[PDB]
Coordinates of N, CA and C in Angstrom, one line a residue:
Chain D
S1 N -22.3 16.5 -5.3 CA -23.0 17.0 -6.4 C -22.0 17.5 -7.5
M2 N -21.0 18.3 -7.1 CA -20.0 18.7 -8.0 C -19.2 17.5 -8.5
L3 N -19.0 16.5 -7.6 CA -18.4 15.3 -8.0 C -19.2 14.6 -9.1
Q4 N -20.5 14.5 -8.9 CA -21.4 13.8 -9.8 C -21.4 14.5 -11.2
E5 N -21.4 15.8 -11.2 CA -21.4 16.5 -12.5 C -20.0 16.5 -13.1
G6 N -19.0 16.3 -12.4 CA -17.6 16.4 -12.9 C -17.0 15.0 -13.2
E7 N -17.8 13.9 -12.8 CA -17.4 12.5 -13.0 C -16.8 12.2 -14.3
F8 N -17.4 12.8 -15.4 CA -17.1 12.5 -16.7 C -15.6 12.8 -17.0
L9 N -15.0 13.7 -16.3 CA -13.6 14.1 -16.4 C -12.7 12.9 -16.2
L10 N -13.1 12.0 -15.3 CA -12.2 10.9 -15.0 C -12.1 9.9 -16.2
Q11 N -12.8 10.1 -17.3 CA -12.7 9.3 -18.5 C -11.3 9.5 -19.1
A12 N -10.5 10.5 -18.7 CA -9.2 10.7 -19.1 C -8.2 9.8 -18.5
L13 N -8.6 9.2 -17.3 CA -7.8 8.2 -16.6 C -7.8 6.9 -17.4
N14 N -6.7 6.1 -17.3 CA -6.7 4.8 -17.9 C -7.1 3.7 -16.8
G15 N -8.3 3.8 -16.3 CA -8.8 2.9 -15.3 C -9.9 3.7 -14.5
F16 N -10.4 3.1 -13.5 CA -11.5 3.7 -12.7 C -11.0 3.9 -11.3
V17 N -11.7 4.9 -10.6 CA -11.4 5.2 -9.2 C -12.2 4.4 -8.3
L18 N -11.5 3.8 -7.3 CA -12.1 3.0 -6.3 C -11.7 3.5 -4.9
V19 N -12.7 3.7 -4.0 CA -12.4 4.1 -2.6 C -13.1 3.1 -1.8
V20 N -12.4 2.3 -1.0 CA -12.9 1.3 -0.1 C -12.5 1.5 1.3
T21 N -13.6 1.5 2.2 CA -13.3 1.7 3.6 C -12.8 0.4 4.3
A22 N -12.4 0.5 5.6 CA -11.9 -0.6 6.3 C -12.8 -1.7 6.5
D23 N -14.1 -1.4 6.6 CA -15.2 -2.4 6.7 C -15.4 -3.1 5.4
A24 N -14.6 -2.8 4.4 CA -14.6 -3.4 3.1 C -15.8 -3.0 2.3
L25 N -16.4 -1.9 2.6 CA -17.4 -1.3 1.8 C -16.8 -0.4 0.7
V26 N -17.4 -0.4 -0.5 CA -17.0 0.6 -1.5 C -17.6 1.9 -1.1
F27 N -16.8 2.9 -0.7 CA -17.2 4.2 -0.4 C -17.5 4.9 -1.6
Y28 N -16.7 4.7 -2.6 CA -16.9 5.4 -3.9 C -16.3 4.6 -5.1
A29 N -17.0 4.7 -6.2 CA -16.4 4.2 -7.4 C -16.8 5.1 -8.6
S30 N -15.9 5.5 -9.4 CA -16.2 6.4 -10.5 C -17.1 5.7 -11.5
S31 N -18.0 6.5 -12.2 CA -18.9 6.0 -13.2 C -18.2 5.2 -14.3
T32 N -17.0 5.6 -14.5 CA -16.2 5.0 -15.6 C -16.0 3.5 -15.3
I33 N -16.3 3.0 -14.1 CA -16.2 1.6 -13.7 C -17.1 0.8 -14.7
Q34 N -18.2 1.4 -15.2 CA -19.1 0.7 -16.1 C -18.3 0.4 -17.4
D35 N -17.3 1.2 -17.8 CA -16.6 1.0 -19.0 C -15.6 -0.1 -18.9
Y36 N -15.3 -0.5 -17.7 CA -14.3 -1.6 -17.6 C -14.9 -2.9 -17.1
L37 N -15.8 -2.8 -16.1 CA -16.4 -4.0 -15.6 C -17.9 -4.2 -16.0
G38 N -18.5 -3.1 -16.5 CA -19.8 -3.2 -16.9 C -20.8 -3.0 -15.8
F39 N -20.3 -2.8 -14.6 CA -21.2 -2.6 -13.4 C -21.5 -1.1 -13.4
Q40 N -22.7 -0.8 -12.9 CA -23.0 0.6 -12.6 C -22.5 1.1 -11.3
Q41 N -22.1 2.3 -11.2 CA -21.6 2.9 -10.0 C -22.6 2.6 -8.9
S42 N -23.9 2.8 -9.1 CA -24.9 2.6 -8.1 C -25.1 1.2 -7.6
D43 N -24.7 0.2 -8.4 CA -24.8 -1.2 -8.0 C -23.7 -1.5 -7.0
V44 N -22.6 -0.8 -7.0 CA -21.4 -1.1 -6.3 C -21.2 -0.3 -5.0
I45 N -21.5 1.0 -5.1 CA -21.3 1.8 -3.9 C -22.2 1.3 -2.7
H46 N -21.6 1.4 -1.5 CA -22.2 0.9 -0.3 C -22.4 -0.6 -0.2
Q47 N -21.8 -1.3 -1.1 CA -21.8 -2.8 -1.1 C -20.3 -3.2 -0.8
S48 N -20.2 -4.5 -0.4 CA -18.8 -5.0 -0.2 C -18.0 -5.2 -1.5
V49 N -16.8 -4.8 -1.5 CA -15.9 -5.0 -2.6 C -15.7 -6.5 -3.0
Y50 N -15.9 -7.4 -2.0 CA -15.6 -8.8 -2.3 C -16.5 -9.4 -3.3
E51 N -17.7 -8.7 -3.5 CA -18.6 -9.2 -4.5 C -18.1 -8.9 -5.9
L52 N -17.1 -8.0 -6.0 CA -16.5 -7.7 -7.3 C -15.3 -8.5 -7.5
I53 N -14.8 -9.1 -6.5 CA -13.5 -9.8 -6.5 C -13.5 -11.3 -6.6
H54 N -12.7 -11.9 -7.4 CA -12.5 -13.3 -7.5 C -12.2 -13.9 -6.1
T55 N -12.8 -15.0 -5.8 CA -12.7 -15.6 -4.4 C -11.3 -15.9 -4.0
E56 N -10.4 -16.1 -5.0 CA -9.0 -16.4 -4.7 C -8.2 -15.2 -4.4
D57 N -8.7 -14.0 -4.9 CA -7.9 -12.8 -4.8 C -8.4 -11.9 -3.7
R58 N -9.5 -12.4 -3.0 CA -10.1 -11.7 -1.9 C -9.2 -11.5 -0.7
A59 N -8.4 -12.6 -0.4 CA -7.5 -12.6 0.7 C -6.5 -11.5 0.5
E60 N -6.0 -11.4 -0.7 CA -5.0 -10.4 -1.1 C -5.5 -9.0 -0.9
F61 N -6.7 -8.8 -1.4 CA -7.3 -7.4 -1.2 C -7.4 -7.1 0.2
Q62 N -7.9 -8.0 1.0 CA -8.2 -7.9 2.4 C -6.8 -7.5 3.1
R63 N -5.8 -8.2 2.6 CA -4.4 -7.9 3.1 C -4.0 -6.5 2.8
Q64 N -4.4 -6.0 1.6 CA -4.0 -4.7 1.1 C -4.7 -3.6 2.0
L65 N -5.9 -4.0 2.6 CA -6.7 -3.1 3.4 C -6.0 -2.9 4.7
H66 N -5.0 -3.7 5.0 CA -4.3 -3.6 6.3 C -3.0 -2.8 6.4
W67 N -2.9 -2.1 7.5 CA -1.8 -1.2 7.7 C -0.4 -1.9 7.6
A68 N -0.4 -3.1 8.2 CA 0.8 -3.9 8.3 C 0.9 -4.8 7.0
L69 N 2.1 -4.7 6.3 CA 2.3 -5.4 5.1 C 1.9 -6.9 5.0
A70 N -4.2 11.1 8.9 CA -2.8 11.5 9.1 C -1.9 11.2 8.0
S71 N -1.1 10.1 8.1 CA -0.2 9.7 7.1 C -0.7 8.6 6.2
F72 N 0.1 8.0 5.3 CA -0.4 7.0 4.4 C 0.6 6.0 4.0
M73 N 0.1 4.8 3.5 CA 1.0 3.7 3.0 C 0.7 3.5 1.4
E74 N 1.8 3.4 0.6 CA 1.6 3.2 -0.8 C 1.1 1.8 -1.0
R75 N 0.3 1.6 -2.0 CA -0.3 0.3 -2.4 C -0.3 0.1 -3.9
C76 N 0.2 -1.1 -4.3 CA 0.3 -1.4 -5.7 C 0.2 -2.9 -5.8
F77 N -0.9 -3.4 -6.3 CA -1.1 -4.9 -6.3 C -2.0 -5.4 -7.4
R78 N -2.1 -6.7 -7.7 CA -2.8 -7.3 -8.7 C -4.1 -7.9 -8.2
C79 N -5.2 -7.8 -8.9 CA -6.5 -8.4 -8.5 C -7.5 -8.6 -9.6
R80 N -8.2 -9.7 -9.7 CA -9.2 -10.0 -10.7 C -10.6 -9.5 -10.3
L81 N -11.2 -8.8 -11.1 CA -12.6 -8.2 -10.8 C -13.6 -8.8 -11.8
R82 N -14.8 -9.0 -11.3 CA -15.9 -9.5 -12.1 C -16.2 -8.5 -13.2
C83 N -16.2 -9.1 -14.4 CA -16.3 -8.3 -15.6 C -17.5 -8.8 -16.5
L84 N -18.5 -8.0 -16.7 CA -19.7 -8.4 -17.4 C -19.6 -8.1 -18.9
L85 N -18.4 -7.7 -19.3 CA -18.1 -7.4 -20.7 C -17.6 -8.6 -21.5
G86 N -15.0 -13.9 -18.0 CA -15.9 -13.6 -16.8 C -15.2 -12.6 -15.8
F87 N -13.9 -12.5 -16.0 CA -13.1 -11.7 -15.0 C -12.1 -10.9 -15.8
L88 N -11.7 -9.7 -15.2 CA -10.7 -8.8 -15.8 C -9.6 -8.6 -14.8
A89 N -8.4 -8.9 -15.1 CA -7.2 -8.7 -14.3 C -6.8 -7.2 -14.2
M90 N -6.7 -6.7 -13.0 CA -6.4 -5.2 -12.9 C -5.3 -5.0 -11.9
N91 N -4.6 -3.9 -12.1 CA -3.6 -3.4 -11.1 C -4.2 -2.3 -10.3
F92 N -4.3 -2.4 -9.0 CA -4.7 -1.3 -8.2 C -3.5 -0.5 -7.7
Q93 N -3.6 0.8 -7.8 CA -2.5 1.7 -7.5 C -3.0 2.8 -6.7
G94 N -2.6 3.0 -5.5 CA -3.1 4.1 -4.6 C -2.5 4.1 -3.3
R95 N -3.3 4.6 -2.3 CA -2.8 4.8 -0.9 C -3.8 4.4 0.1
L96 N -3.2 3.9 1.2 CA -4.0 3.6 2.4 C -3.9 4.8 3.4
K97 N -5.0 5.4 3.7 CA -5.0 6.5 4.6 C -6.3 6.7 5.4
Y98 N -6.3 7.5 6.4 CA -7.5 7.8 7.2 C -8.5 8.6 6.4
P99 N -14.8 7.4 16.1 CA -13.5 7.9 15.6 C -13.4 7.4 14.2
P100 N -12.7 8.2 13.3 CA -12.5 7.9 11.9 C -11.8 6.6 11.6
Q101 N -12.0 6.1 10.4 CA -11.4 4.8 9.9 C -10.4 4.9 8.8
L102 N -9.7 3.8 8.5 CA -8.7 3.7 7.4 C -9.4 3.5 6.1
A103 N -8.8 4.0 5.0 CA -9.4 3.8 3.7 C -8.4 3.7 2.5
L104 N -8.7 2.8 1.6 CA -7.9 2.6 0.4 C -8.5 3.5 -0.8
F105 N -7.6 4.5 -1.2 CA -8.0 5.3 -2.4 C -7.1 4.8 -3.5
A106 N -7.7 4.3 -4.6 CA -6.9 3.7 -5.7 C -7.5 4.0 -7.1
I107 N -6.6 3.7 -8.1 CA -7.1 3.6 -9.5 C -6.8 2.2 -9.9
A108 N -7.9 1.6 -10.5 CA -7.8 0.2 -11.0 C -7.6 0.3 -12.5
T109 N -6.5 -0.3 -13.0 CA -6.1 -0.2 -14.4 C -6.0 -1.6 -15.0
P110 N -6.6 -1.7 -16.2 CA -6.5 -3.0 -16.9 C -5.1 -3.4 -17.3
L111 N -4.8 -4.7 -17.4 CA -3.4 -5.1 -17.7 C -3.3 -5.2 -19.2
Chain T
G1 N -16.3 17.0 0.4 CA -15.3 18.0 0.4 C -14.1 17.5 1.2
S2 N -14.2 16.6 2.1 CA -13.1 16.0 2.9 C -12.6 14.7 2.3
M3 N -13.5 13.8 1.9 CA -13.1 12.6 1.2 C -12.6 13.0 -0.2
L4 N -13.2 14.0 -0.8 CA -12.7 14.5 -2.1 C -11.3 15.0 -1.9
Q5 N -11.1 15.7 -0.8 CA -9.8 16.3 -0.4 C -8.8 15.1 -0.2
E6 N -9.2 14.1 0.5 CA -8.4 12.9 0.8 C -8.0 12.1 -0.5
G7 N -8.9 12.2 -1.5 CA -8.6 11.5 -2.8 C -8.0 12.4 -3.9
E8 N -7.8 13.7 -3.6 CA -7.1 14.6 -4.5 C -5.9 14.0 -5.3
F9 N -5.0 13.4 -4.5 CA -3.8 12.9 -5.1 C -3.9 12.0 -6.3
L10 N -5.0 11.3 -6.4 CA -5.3 10.4 -7.5 C -5.3 11.1 -8.8
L11 N -5.6 12.4 -8.8 CA -5.6 13.2 -10.0 C -4.2 13.6 -10.5
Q12 N -3.2 13.1 -9.8 CA -1.8 13.2 -10.3 C -1.6 12.4 -11.5
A13 N -2.4 11.4 -11.8 CA -2.3 10.6 -13.0 C -2.8 11.3 -14.2
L14 N -3.5 12.4 -14.0 CA -4.0 13.2 -15.2 C -2.8 14.0 -15.8
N15 N -3.0 14.3 -17.1 CA -2.1 15.2 -17.8 C -2.6 16.6 -17.8
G16 N -2.7 17.2 -16.6 CA -3.2 18.5 -16.5 C -3.9 18.7 -15.1
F17 N -4.6 19.8 -14.9 CA -5.3 20.0 -13.7 C -6.8 20.2 -13.9
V18 N -7.6 19.9 -12.9 CA -9.1 20.0 -13.1 C -9.4 21.4 -12.6
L19 N -10.2 22.1 -13.4 CA -10.7 23.4 -13.1 C -12.2 23.5 -13.3
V20 N -12.9 24.0 -12.4 CA -14.4 24.2 -12.5 C -14.7 25.6 -12.3
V21 N -15.3 26.3 -13.3 CA -15.6 27.7 -13.3 C -17.1 27.9 -13.5
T22 N -17.7 28.7 -12.6 CA -19.1 28.9 -12.7 C -19.4 30.0 -13.7
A23 N -20.7 30.3 -14.0 CA -21.1 31.2 -15.0 C -20.7 32.6 -14.7
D24 N -20.6 33.0 -13.4 CA -20.1 34.3 -13.0 C -18.6 34.4 -13.1
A25 N -18.0 33.4 -13.7 CA -16.5 33.3 -13.9 C -15.7 33.2 -12.6
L26 N -16.3 32.6 -11.6 CA -15.5 32.3 -10.3 C -14.9 30.9 -10.4
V27 N -13.8 30.7 -9.8 CA -13.3 29.3 -9.7 C -14.0 28.6 -8.6
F28 N -14.8 27.6 -8.9 CA -15.5 26.9 -7.9 C -14.6 25.9 -7.3
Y29 N -13.7 25.3 -8.1 CA -12.8 24.3 -7.7 C -11.6 24.2 -8.6
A30 N -10.5 23.9 -8.0 CA -9.2 23.6 -8.8 C -8.5 22.5 -8.1
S31 N -8.1 21.5 -8.8 CA -7.4 20.4 -8.2 C -6.0 20.8 -7.6
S32 N -5.5 20.2 -6.6 CA -4.2 20.6 -6.0 C -3.1 20.6 -7.0
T33 N -3.3 19.7 -8.0 CA -2.3 19.5 -9.0 C -2.1 20.8 -9.8
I34 N -2.9 21.8 -9.6 CA -2.7 23.1 -10.3 C -1.3 23.6 -9.9
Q35 N -0.9 23.3 -8.7 CA 0.4 23.8 -8.2 C 1.6 23.2 -9.1
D36 N 1.4 22.1 -9.7 CA 2.4 21.5 -10.5 C 2.5 22.1 -11.9
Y37 N 1.5 22.9 -12.3 CA 1.5 23.5 -13.6 C 1.7 25.0 -13.6
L38 N 0.9 25.6 -12.7 CA 0.9 27.1 -12.6 C 1.7 27.6 -11.4
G39 N 1.9 26.8 -10.4 CA 2.6 27.2 -9.2 C 1.7 27.8 -8.2
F40 N 0.4 27.9 -8.5 CA -0.6 28.4 -7.5 C -1.0 27.3 -6.6
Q41 N -1.4 27.7 -5.3 CA -2.1 26.8 -4.5 C -3.6 26.8 -4.7
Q42 N -4.2 25.6 -4.6 CA -5.6 25.4 -4.7 C -6.4 26.4 -3.9
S43 N -6.0 26.6 -2.6 CA -6.8 27.4 -1.7 C -6.7 28.9 -2.0
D44 N -5.6 29.4 -2.7 CA -5.5 30.8 -3.1 C -6.3 31.1 -4.3
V45 N -6.7 30.1 -5.0 CA -7.3 30.3 -6.4 C -8.8 30.2 -6.3
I46 N -9.3 29.2 -5.5 CA -10.7 29.0 -5.4 C -11.4 30.2 -4.9
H47 N -12.6 30.5 -5.4 CA -13.5 31.7 -5.1 C -12.9 33.0 -5.7
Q48 N -11.9 32.9 -6.5 CA -11.5 34.1 -7.2 C -11.9 34.0 -8.7
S49 N -11.9 35.1 -9.3 CA -12.3 35.2 -10.8 C -11.2 34.5 -11.6
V50 N -11.6 33.7 -12.6 CA -10.6 33.1 -13.5 C -9.8 34.1 -14.3
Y51 N -10.4 35.3 -14.5 CA -9.8 36.3 -15.3 C -8.4 36.8 -14.7
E52 N -8.3 36.6 -13.4 CA -7.0 36.9 -12.8 C -5.9 36.0 -13.1
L53 N -6.3 34.8 -13.6 CA -5.3 33.8 -14.0 C -5.1 33.8 -15.5
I54 N -5.9 34.6 -16.2 CA -5.9 34.5 -17.7 C -5.3 35.8 -18.3
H55 N -4.4 35.5 -19.3 CA -3.8 36.6 -20.1 C -4.9 37.5 -20.6
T56 N -4.7 38.8 -20.5 CA -5.8 39.8 -20.9 C -6.3 39.6 -22.3
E57 N -5.4 39.1 -23.2 CA -5.8 38.9 -24.6 C -6.7 37.7 -24.8
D58 N -6.7 36.8 -23.8 CA -7.5 35.5 -23.9 C -8.8 35.6 -23.1
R59 N -9.0 36.7 -22.4 CA -10.2 36.8 -21.5 C -11.5 36.8 -22.2
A60 N -11.6 37.5 -23.3 CA -12.9 37.6 -24.1 C -13.2 36.2 -24.6
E61 N -12.2 35.5 -25.1 CA -12.4 34.2 -25.6 C -12.9 33.2 -24.6
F62 N -12.3 33.3 -23.4 CA -12.7 32.4 -22.3 C -14.2 32.7 -22.0
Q63 N -14.5 34.0 -21.9 CA -15.9 34.4 -21.6 C -16.9 33.8 -22.6
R64 N -16.5 33.9 -23.9 CA -17.4 33.5 -24.9 C -17.6 32.0 -24.8
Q65 N -16.5 31.3 -24.5 CA -16.5 29.9 -24.4 C -17.3 29.4 -23.2
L66 N -17.4 30.2 -22.2 CA -18.1 29.9 -20.9 C -19.6 30.0 -21.1
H67 N -20.0 30.6 -22.2 CA -21.5 30.8 -22.4 C -22.0 29.6 -23.3
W68 N -23.1 29.0 -22.9 CA -23.6 27.8 -23.5 C -23.8 28.0 -25.0
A69 N -24.3 29.2 -25.4 CA -24.5 29.5 -26.8 C -23.4 30.2 -27.5
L70 N -22.2 30.3 -26.8 CA -21.1 31.1 -27.3 C -21.4 32.6 -27.5
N71 N -22.3 33.1 -26.7 CA -22.9 34.4 -27.0 C -23.1 35.2 -25.6
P72 N -21.9 35.5 -25.0 CA -21.9 35.9 -23.5 C -22.7 37.2 -23.2
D73 N -22.9 38.1 -24.1 CA -23.4 39.5 -23.9 C -22.4 40.4 -23.2
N74 N -23.7 18.5 -33.6 CA -24.9 17.9 -32.9 C -24.5 17.0 -31.7
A75 N -23.5 17.4 -30.9 CA -23.1 16.5 -29.8 C -24.2 16.3 -28.8
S76 N -23.9 15.4 -27.8 CA -24.8 15.0 -26.7 C -24.5 15.8 -25.5
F77 N -23.6 16.8 -25.6 CA -23.1 17.6 -24.5 C -22.7 18.9 -25.0
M78 N -22.5 19.9 -24.1 CA -22.0 21.2 -24.6 C -20.6 21.2 -24.3
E79 N -19.9 20.6 -25.2 CA -18.4 20.4 -25.2 C -17.7 21.7 -25.5
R80 N -16.5 21.8 -24.8 CA -15.7 23.0 -25.0 C -14.2 22.5 -25.1
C81 N -13.5 23.0 -26.1 CA -12.2 22.6 -26.4 C -11.5 23.8 -27.0
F82 N -10.6 24.5 -26.2 CA -10.1 25.7 -26.6 C -8.7 26.1 -26.0
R83 N -8.1 27.1 -26.5 CA -6.7 27.5 -26.1 C -6.8 28.7 -25.2
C84 N -5.9 28.7 -24.2 CA -5.9 29.8 -23.2 C -4.6 29.9 -22.5
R85 N -4.1 31.1 -22.3 CA -2.8 31.3 -21.6 C -3.1 31.6 -20.1
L86 N -2.5 30.9 -19.2 CA -2.8 31.0 -17.8 C -1.5 31.6 -17.1
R87 N -1.7 32.3 -16.0 CA -0.6 32.8 -15.2 C 0.2 31.7 -14.6
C88 N 1.5 31.7 -14.8 CA 2.3 30.6 -14.4 C 3.5 31.2 -13.5
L89 N 3.6 30.8 -12.3 CA 4.6 31.4 -11.4 C 5.9 30.5 -11.3
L90 N 6.0 29.6 -12.2 CA 7.2 28.7 -12.2 C 8.4 29.3 -13.0
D91 N 9.6 28.9 -12.6 CA 10.8 29.5 -13.1 C 11.0 29.3 -14.6
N92 N 10.6 28.2 -15.1 CA 10.8 27.9 -16.5 C 9.7 28.5 -17.4
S93 N 9.3 29.8 -17.1 CA 8.2 30.5 -17.7 C 8.4 32.0 -17.7
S94 N 7.7 32.7 -18.6 CA 7.7 34.1 -18.7 C 6.5 34.7 -18.0
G95 N 5.8 34.0 -17.2 CA 4.6 34.4 -16.5 C 3.4 33.7 -17.0
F96 N 3.5 33.1 -18.2 CA 2.3 32.5 -18.8 C 2.6 31.1 -19.4
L97 N 1.6 30.3 -19.4 CA 1.6 28.9 -19.8 C 0.5 28.7 -20.8
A98 N 0.7 28.3 -22.0 CA -0.3 28.1 -23.0 C -0.9 26.7 -22.7
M99 N -2.3 26.7 -22.5 CA -3.0 25.5 -22.1 C -4.2 25.2 -23.0
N100 N -4.6 24.0 -23.1 CA -5.8 23.6 -23.7 C -6.8 23.2 -22.7
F101 N -8.0 23.9 -22.7 CA -9.1 23.5 -21.9 C -9.9 22.6 -22.6
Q102 N -10.3 21.5 -22.0 CA -11.1 20.5 -22.6 C -12.1 20.0 -21.6
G103 N -13.4 20.2 -21.9 CA -14.5 19.8 -20.9 C -15.9 20.0 -21.4
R104 N -16.8 20.2 -20.4 CA -18.2 20.3 -20.7 C -18.8 21.4 -19.9
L105 N -19.9 22.0 -20.4 CA -20.6 23.0 -19.7 C -21.9 22.3 -19.2
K106 N -22.1 22.4 -17.9 CA -23.2 21.7 -17.2 C -23.7 22.6 -16.0
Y107 N -24.9 22.4 -15.6 CA -25.4 23.1 -14.4 C -24.9 22.6 -13.1
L108 N -24.4 23.5 -12.3 CA -23.9 23.2 -11.0 C -24.9 23.4 -9.9
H109 N -25.6 22.3 -9.4 CA -26.5 22.4 -8.3 C -25.7 22.3 -7.0
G110 N -26.4 22.8 -5.9 CA -25.8 22.7 -4.6 C -25.4 24.0 -3.9
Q111 N -25.0 25.0 -4.7 CA -24.7 26.3 -4.2 C -25.9 27.0 -3.5
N112 N -25.7 28.1 -2.8 CA -26.7 28.8 -2.0 C -27.5 27.8 -1.1
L113 N -32.0 30.7 -5.0 CA -31.3 31.1 -6.2 C -31.0 29.9 -7.1
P114 N -31.3 30.1 -8.4 CA -31.3 28.9 -9.4 C -29.9 28.5 -9.8
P115 N -29.7 27.2 -10.1 CA -28.4 26.7 -10.5 C -27.8 27.5 -11.8
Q116 N -26.5 27.6 -11.8 CA -25.9 28.3 -12.9 C -25.1 27.3 -13.8
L117 N -24.7 27.7 -15.0 CA -23.9 26.9 -15.8 C -22.5 27.0 -15.3
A118 N -21.7 25.9 -15.5 CA -20.3 25.9 -15.1 C -19.5 25.0 -16.1
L119 N -18.3 25.4 -16.3 CA -17.4 24.7 -17.2 C -16.6 23.8 -16.2
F120 N -16.7 22.5 -16.5 CA -15.9 21.4 -15.8 C -14.9 21.0 -16.9
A121 N -13.6 21.3 -16.6 CA -12.6 21.0 -17.6 C -11.3 20.5 -17.0
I122 N -10.5 19.9 -17.9 CA -9.1 19.7 -17.6 C -8.3 20.6 -18.5
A123 N -7.4 21.3 -17.8 CA -6.4 22.2 -18.4 C -5.1 21.5 -18.6
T124 N -4.7 21.3 -19.9 CA -3.5 20.5 -20.2 C -2.5 21.4 -20.9
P125 N -1.2 21.3 -20.5 CA -0.2 22.2 -21.1 C 0.1 21.8 -22.5
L126 N 0.4 22.8 -23.4 CA 0.7 22.5 -24.8 C 2.1 22.2 -25.1

């Protein structure tokens, strides 16, 4: 709830926040996603990320979800996302970190 | 609070730290990145009065700014943008760091009693 009321603060970022679990579900996406892709936060959370991703770039994202190329792994990669404003090329920058599962915490920035 | 905690580091991209202060002037939240500007740890600061972090000369102004009507006793939001000196424990300082608070005043639900107003802001060094 604090996160929901404080969401607007992430407008200072040059991109949107994306958190994706190992099962490839979007655990979280900042509302600012609407400003880049035109999707609403609510349309995207609890759904698969692959619906947002170009079919050719899906394998790469899936790869990024993997530990092999507590603690964390740095992640920095390119990926095209569905953009209703047909696609928008973005750089994902973040970390892979954690019975509990593994998760990608990232910022997606337009090129 | 745990996933938020796990995602904290992403706020390192910001030019400042996130501060959330309730109407009673308590720090509800501060991003870990506060340590990079003021030298305080997040856990030491949360649940304490902001006035402990504020220069005594800037306290009245903070209080006024914390009140929705600017009266403590055409935008689409209750925006706040103001100057404030904060206690800074870092070596390149005389104890204080001049910062700009920029954010919005909104009701904070979830606590506990009726929701209170809170300043959600980013504090940026000048």
